[PDB]
Design a protein around this ligand. Structure first.
Ligand SMILES: *Cc1c(COP(=O)(O)O)cnc(C)c1O
Ligand SMILES: *Cc1c(COP(=O)(O)O)cnc(C)c1O
Ligand SMILES: [Cl-]
Ligand SMILES: [Cl-]
Ligand SMILES: [Cl-]
Ligand SMILES: [Cl-]
Ligand SMILES: [Cl-]
Ligand SMILES: [Cl-]
Ligand SMILES: [Cl-]
Ligand SMILES: [Cl-]
Ligand SMILES: [Cl-]
Ligand SMILES: [Cl-]
Ligand SMILES: [Cl-]
Ligand SMILES: [Cl-]
Ligand SMILES: [Cs+]
Ligand SMILES: [Cs+]
Ligand SMILES: [Cs+]
Ligand SMILES: [Cs+]
Ligand SMILES: [Cs+]
Ligand SMILES: [Cs+]
Ligand SMILES: [Cs+]
Ligand SMILES: [Cs+]
Ligand SMILES: [Cs+]
Lengths: 253, 395, 395, 253
């Protein structure tokens, strides 16, 4: 499929950036997670980034660590996550769905089989948080064989060699953690950049797009709303809807 | 790009977020430079000798082997400053931190021995040390925590995940990814991402070098086998490295069998786990069927690492080294044996290596064999644990 | 009649019941013979090196002395097997027992360090060891008692008198007077009746010999002063002996001042007691006005001997050595200082010697002086004691 | 005075051995100790051996250790012991009184002053338990200057040199811990031997005398009767009287 390509072309036509919320699948439980995700979509999320609970999330801060703990507390397994992904794709045929994975869960039952399962349920991209570009070859190859975009992080400490590698090897979008970077990525024909550092308010969404990025990823702020409203699922959904609506509005021309 | 091969065969690698690669490349660069620098080597040798007390003794154990054709020597890492071999490599890593212009040390610790080792090295070299430790571990390791704080280290209790070693391992990396311009991450074993398995081996290799010289002087030949306990793999690779190319010398690593392999409550991933990717490396792991990392189990908290260094995985795959396990009760017997028959209280970690040497001897008492056990640490720390079990059994 | 002079000036002697004189004469005879026997000396050197780990390091302490004209080195007896210098002389006495054809060891212990030292030496050399210990001491020294029993020693709680060290001292002699054909009494310090102050000095003198060689190599001259803590006097006389004839070298012994000399709660008989005759010797004693022997007091149980070796009394009287005291709080500060600034946890005994060296430096920071402190043991054993005080003070 | 000399001459005339009980002064208290001692005398003790409570009694077994503890528990001091000794001598002018001392209490206020005090209160002999003959010179000299007999122990492990020294240096009596010894002591003109090992029954008293000794010292058995009857002072005295009477009877020709 070409879900990212189609999304970016449509957004471009509307002079619009992407807004992409992250949540952990199964947080705080399977049924509630499903309603969360549909709420994000109905509020105007342009794509999703979705985490699978893992014992040791090396690249993640406190909010996400806590999301993981909640999802495990609920007994959420990778198999159940893939069941969820199939359901989500069945409800929503065009929205790009990206996973944020840890290497062990990809490698566990064979790397090729993992990406085969991704393709079967209708995932579009996979970011493997603990695989640097230098080690990515078998992950990228398996991804592309199964029509999955491999996503790479372009960190603040990126050099020119890294930019070229990220530009050449990534598809779907480039995950930016930051303006020089944005210009260089475009020069090297990289996948459109989404800014993923510190996107917690509408002004940062607008700032990302104004700087030349194709959009912005809210890496933790959505999870913060979950964590805050655990005792009140109805209010949780309410607050997610208004937050996502506001963030997406900020992306609009 | 790296200067050195990050893999041992299929095992090892640099499986860290992209943000941490410059820190690893920097460290590798600094290490490669250090290893060529006579001044660095002279400074390290000075610390090992005048501060830590190298060379360490090689003790013959005639009382234990009487009436058999085994000759047994203990390499006495238990006599090193700090009471375990960990001290060797923390002094080297501290000097590397200084070489890179860093003024702060970050360390992870489980049982606390690495925390104390890191803190003492930091105090000596005037580095500001902060140590991550699982809240559960903090609770159960009061003596070690107090030693760390006495030595001026900040001890940071980790409440995330299970709140144990693997979680401390994670939180140290989080800090380092933000602080690496000023802070060095002092990893406690021969594992994790390259270049750490390489650095830690080379900063422990004097164990084996001295053993070889000492056994040549005392016996006029190489040992038939050298035997070491395996947590993450540092003491063992330190004893093994200088012998790898002496292909007549057996290299035997001993993983904790805990309550018994068949119970699943052990710490022997190399022989009874499954390759995975975690802690920055591709290596055998204790893990569930769907790929979640598990805690190991051993009587000995210091062998409770749920993976193993990649060079050990490699050496096993090519058949250069053999790996075995020793259960809690076997290690306890070896502990008692050494106290009573040699007047040395060994670490319960090291007691696993001794137990396997005692098995080699007892199973085949007329086999002529010259064995060295790496006695990785002393066991004062373990006397409460041993007391508690013996009482509970009615001993 | 004896082969050697039993007195140091007016101090020392053999003040034991008549029944014990043949045992003392036998021991003196065996020692004089041993000291002339290259085989005995080679065996002793073998144990010290290959078992106990001699030579011990001499560590420079630049962090502590920064900004002053003091250069400070620690002689690292804390790195010896067993974690204190006691090990040197128990190995020698065990070999002497073997030379005399004895198969059993009797020992007294207060804090337990000598009991453990005796037990480990006995285990190594295959001697059957029984250790007398005051019931009060047994109660308060659970870790040491357990180590002794692990090493195969019989531990005998003494319920007589106050049921402390002096009473253990008595009950060991009672046993020996009946058993000396088969048992050797392994006295724990450089005190008691001749020939023990002499034997213990000579079996500790490598401390000072190595220090002299090491300081010549590192600094090209002798130290201005060597400084040691004084319980019964063994570590100190061990450091001092090889320097006695180097009259430019100050010899400074540090007695425990406890809560302060003026409080009477201390362990400093050499400077603040009164000569008496007890424990087989004429020497300064803690005693009442009517001549009953008192208990000393120190934060450090190992400096709680209520007398002092006669050679120290002698050296003081002729002005060859100077003796000073250091209080509990001074020793505690020195303990903290060494942990934080050098990453070495010292014994609270040894912390008294360090405290006085720190005073020498701080009082006169522009005085050029090269000082060695005998770091008689490591202080893992003391961390609960230190923790308890710091908490009680709110630290 | 010549109390020992007179006693031995009188006993010899009657073909009789000496019986000498040991007690600790002040055990179990001052007044009771005084009655004990008068009871021993009235029952037929030929001489007394009397201990002064000391913190560290190096030469003493369990029964005596316990006697010491009792006397300290009662607050008994050396000064009070010397008060007791003066009273005892005033009651009984001919019986030889020997002390068993520890070196520290003799040396404490000056050795000469100690023996001067002994002479003043009417003591006849001093055994210093932790001073071997080899170290005895200042104790013997002070003793004789003050008309006090220095007493030495002749142990089972004695050699010929020791026998000669003990014979030459001791006065009053020789304290034997054991027949060769008895013959050698007489050959060397030693003070008459009293057997002090294991004298706990009449047969041992008779055996000592039959072996050629001048008599026997009951080193602990008297103290055992004290320890056994602590709760009953009247019975204590009763049992001491019958025991001493029986022991003395055993010495008689
Ligand atoms: C830390 C420790 C070990 C285990 O770690 P390795 O890295 O496998 O050596 C073993 N023994 C002792 C005494 C230790 O302190
Ligand atoms: C036993 C001990 C001492 C005191 O005894 P000395 O005979 O005076 O040396 C001092 N330091 C340590 C560490 C000891 O173990
Ligand atoms: Cl739910
Ligand atoms: Cl859709
Ligand atoms: Cl590879
Ligand atoms: Cl600092
Ligand atoms: Cl940084
Ligand atoms: Cl082999
Ligand atoms: Cl003299
Ligand atoms: Cl034995
Ligand atoms: Cl005997
Ligand atoms: Cl000087
Ligand atoms: Cl009374
Ligand atoms: Cl009379
Ligand atoms: Cs696999
Ligand atoms: Cs906008
Ligand atoms: Cs050494
Ligand atoms: Cs053997
Ligand atoms: Cs392990
Ligand atoms: Cs200095
Ligand atoms: Cs003392
Ligand atoms: Cs005096
Ligand atoms: Cs008779």
């Amino acid at each position: 499929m070409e879900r990212y390509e189609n999304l970016f072309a449509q957004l471009n036509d509307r002079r619009e950036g992407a807004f992409v919320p992250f949540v952990t699948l199964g947080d705080p439980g399977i049924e509630q997670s499903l309603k969360i995700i549909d709420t994000l979509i109905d509020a105007g999320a342009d794509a999703l980034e979705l985490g699978v609970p893992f014992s040791d999330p090396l690249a993640d801060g406190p909010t996400i660590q806590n999301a993981n703990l909640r999802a495990f507390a609920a007994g959420v397994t990778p198999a159940q996550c893939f069941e969820m992904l199939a359901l989500i794709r069945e409800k929503h045929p065009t929205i790009p769905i990206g996973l944020l994975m840890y290497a062990n869960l990809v490698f566990n039952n064979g790397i090729d089989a993992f990406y085969a399962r991704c393709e079967q349920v209708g995932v579009d991209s996979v970011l493997v948080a603990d695989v640097p570009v230098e080690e990515s070859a078998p992950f990228r190859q398996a991804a592309l064989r199964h029509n999955i975009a491999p996503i790479f992080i372009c960190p603040p400490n990126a050099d020119d060699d890294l930019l070229r590698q990220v530009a050449s090897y990534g598809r779907g979008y480039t995950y930016l953690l930051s303006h020089h970077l944005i210009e260089k990525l475009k020069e090297y024909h990289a996948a459109p950049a989404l800014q993923g550092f510190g996107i917690s308010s509408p002004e940062q969404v607008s700032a990302a797009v104004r700087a030349g990025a194709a959009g912005a990823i809210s890496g933790s702020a959505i999870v913060k709303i979950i964590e805050k409203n655990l005792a009140s699922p109805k209010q949780m959904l309410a607050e997610l809807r208004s937050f996502v609506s506001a963030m997406k509005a900020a992306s609009r021309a | 790009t790296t200067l050195l091969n990050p893999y041992f065969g299929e095992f090892g690698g640099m499986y860290v977020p992209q943000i941490l690669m410059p820190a690893l490349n920097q460290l590798e660069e600094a290490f490669v430079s250090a290893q060529k620098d006579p001044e660095f080597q002279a400074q390290f040798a000075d610390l090992l000798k005048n501060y830590a007390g190298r060379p360490t003794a090689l003790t013959k154990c005639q009382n234990i082997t009487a009436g058999t054709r085994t000759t047994l020597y203990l390499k006495r890492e238990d006599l090193l400053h700090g009471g375990a071999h960990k001290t060797n490599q923390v002094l080297g890593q501290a000097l590397l931190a200084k070489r890179m212009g860093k003024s702060e040390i970050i360390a992870e610790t489980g049982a606390g021995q690495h925390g104390v080792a890191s803190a003492l090295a930091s105090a000596l070299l005037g580095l500001k040390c902060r140590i991550y430790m699982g809240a559960k571990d903090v609770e159960r390791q009061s003596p070690n925590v107090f030693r760390m704080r006495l030595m001026g280290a900040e001890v940071i209790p980790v409440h995330s995940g299970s709140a144990t070693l693997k979680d401390a391992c994670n939180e140290a990396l989080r800090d380092w990814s933000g602080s690496y311009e000023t802070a060095h991450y002092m990893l406690g074993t021969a594992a994790g991402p390259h270049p750490y398995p390489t650095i830690v081996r080379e900063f422990q290799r004097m164990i084996g070098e001295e053993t070889k010289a000492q056994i040549l002087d005392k016996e006029g030949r190489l040992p038939d086998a050298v035997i070491a306990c395996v947590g993450g793999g540092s003491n063992a690779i330190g004893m093994f490295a200088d012998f790898i190319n002496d292909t007549s010398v057996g290299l035997i690593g001993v993983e904790p069998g805990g309550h018994g392999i068949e119970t699943g409550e052990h710490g022997a991933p190399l022989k009874h786990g499954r390759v995975g990717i975690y802690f920055g490396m591709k290596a055998p792991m204790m893990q569930t069927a769907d790929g979640q990392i598990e805690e190991s189990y051993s009587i000995s908290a210091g062998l409770d690492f749920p993976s193993v260094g990649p060079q050990h995985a490699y050496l096993n795959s090519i058949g250069r080294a053999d790996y075995v396990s020793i259960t809690d009760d076997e290690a306890l017997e070896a502990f008692k044996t050494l106290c009573r028959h040699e007047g040395i209280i060994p670490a319960l970690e090291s007691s696993h290596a001794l137990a396997h040497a005692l098995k080699m001897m007892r199973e085949q008492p007329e086999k002529e064999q010259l064995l060295v056990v790496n006695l990785s640490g002393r066991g004062d720390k373990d006397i409460f644990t041993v007391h508690d079990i013996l009482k509970a059994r009615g001993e």
